[PDB]
Amino acid sequence: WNRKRISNCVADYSVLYNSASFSTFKCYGVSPTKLNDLCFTNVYADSFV
Amino acid sequence: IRGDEVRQIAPGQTGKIADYNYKLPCDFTGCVIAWNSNNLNYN
């Protein structure tokens, strides 16, 4: 699985959530609506199929 | 509603239907009944 690190930027998570292309958007430990109010020390985006 | 949104009609669910259309409370005492009505469309 390809791990891509995201750090030191401004993330807009609402555009991903409101997009209808995604079948399932399951958030554990956070709620997707609140995602824009939060500040994270690090983000890891692991991609695969 | 749509078939895939039938899970959104439940307490403590997140989605377009839950937040913008029909919000059930966390302490929802009740029942939810859904049947596929593919007989009765831009209305």
Side-chain angles (χ1 to χ4, degrees):
Chain A
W1 36 270
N2 191 14
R3 161 150 289 189
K4 173 61 179 59
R5 191 181 163 155
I6 292 169
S7 166
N8 288 333
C9 51
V10 171
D12 200 355
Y13 290 130
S14 174
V15 300
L16 312 179
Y17 188 51
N18 63 357
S19 166
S21 54
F22 305 116
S23 61
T24 71
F25 202 104
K26 276 193 284 288
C27 286
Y28 315 103
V30 287
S31 75
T33 69
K34 297 260 186 58
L35 269 173
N36 284 21
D37 291 330
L38 304 176
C39 277
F40 319 97
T41 71
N42 205 0
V43 165
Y44 291 144
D46 316 314
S47 173
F48 50 92
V49 64
Chain B
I1 52 163
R2 287 192 290 123
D4 55 354
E5 297 161 338
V6 76
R7 63 180 179 81
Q8 288 197 20
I9 307 301
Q13 282 296 322
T14 317
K16 303 302 182 57
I17 313 300
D19 63 359
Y20 296 140
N21 302 113
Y22 196 51
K23 187 69 183 172
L24 291 184
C26 298
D27 56 320
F28 168 71
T29 297
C31 294
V32 182
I33 315 170
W35 68 95
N36 188 1
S37 88
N38 209 352
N39 313 121
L40 281 75
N41 198 358
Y42 296 13
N43 310 140

